[PDB]
């Protein structure tokens, strides 16, 4: 998964 935590791009498994 794609997300964004504190205005940066973070991957959360797929």
Partner RNA sequence: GGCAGAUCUGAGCCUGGGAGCUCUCUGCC
Binding site for RNA (CB under 7 A): 3-11, 13-14
Smallest distance, RNA to C-beta of residue 10, A: 4
Smallest distance, RNA to C-beta of residue 13, A: 6
- How many Å apart are CA 14 and CA 7, to the nearest integer? 19
Token representation of residue 2: 């794609």
Smallest distance, RNA to C-beta of residue 2, A: 8
Helices (H), 1-14: none
SS3 of 6, please? Answer: coil
């Amino acid at each position: 998964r794609v997300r964004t935590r504190k205005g940066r791009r973070i991957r959360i498994x797929p």
